[PDB]
């Protein structure tokens, strides 16, 4: 018993979709139902820098202003995306990320937003003492992911959403065969 019948059905369907290898369907259902957060999927999307999918998937579970954990999760991801654009010497893209994704954080700390904006004019953002130890894209995404996992695991909104239930294989298929 997984609480409601809708919740139990979602878990049975997730198993069915995984056995049929409908991989994109599995993650749309996790996202739209918001019943299960797939850490393995999230880690892979982050590792690959698929930022639009990372945020669309997270949006099925939380919004930037839900609590301090949700706020830091979107902040760390958007900061990484901005530093990557500066690292590729792509200043038009970095300004677009700053204005579209990071501006919301100026409502919490205006001085921090000004400091992040000022990185645009440095020849290398590593000249900022807070960022001097930033390695490369690979090392930075791995370090950010270690922090994101801690924030998600401590986030009360992800309670009961991090453990997939123990089910016998093809549970939905067995139950339907029993129904008639």
């Amino acid at each position: 018993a997984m609480g409601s019948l809708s919740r139990e059905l979602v878990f049975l369907i997730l198993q069915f979709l995984d056995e049929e290898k409908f991989k994109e369907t599995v993650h749309k259902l996790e996202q739209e139902s918001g019943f299960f957060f797939n850490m393995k999927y999230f880690e892979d999307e982050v590792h690959n820098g698929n930022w639009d999918e990372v945020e669309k998937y997270l949006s099925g579970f939380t919004k930037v202003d839900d609590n301090r954990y949700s706020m830091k999760i979107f902040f760390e991801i958007r900061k990484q995306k901005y530093l990557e654009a500066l690292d590729k010497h792509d200043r038009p893209k970095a300004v677009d990320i700053l204005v579209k994704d990071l501006k919301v954080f100026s409502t919490f700390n205006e001085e921090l937003f000004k400091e992040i904006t000022q990185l645009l004019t440095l020849e290398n953002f590593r000249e900022n003492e807070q960022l001097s130890k930033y390695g490369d894209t690979k090392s930075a995404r791995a370090i950010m992911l270690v922090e994101l996992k801690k924030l998600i695991e401590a986030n009360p909104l992800f309670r009961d959403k991090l453990q997939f239930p123990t089910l016998r294989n093809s549970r939905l298929r067995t139950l339907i065969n029993q129904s008639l």
């Binding site: 954080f105 921090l112 400091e115 370090i143």
Partner: peptide, 10 residues
């Protein structure tokens, strides 16, 4: 609570 410029996990 504070947001920081520094690398995640300090």
């Amino acid at each position: 609570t504070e947001l920081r410029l520094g690398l995640p996990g300090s």
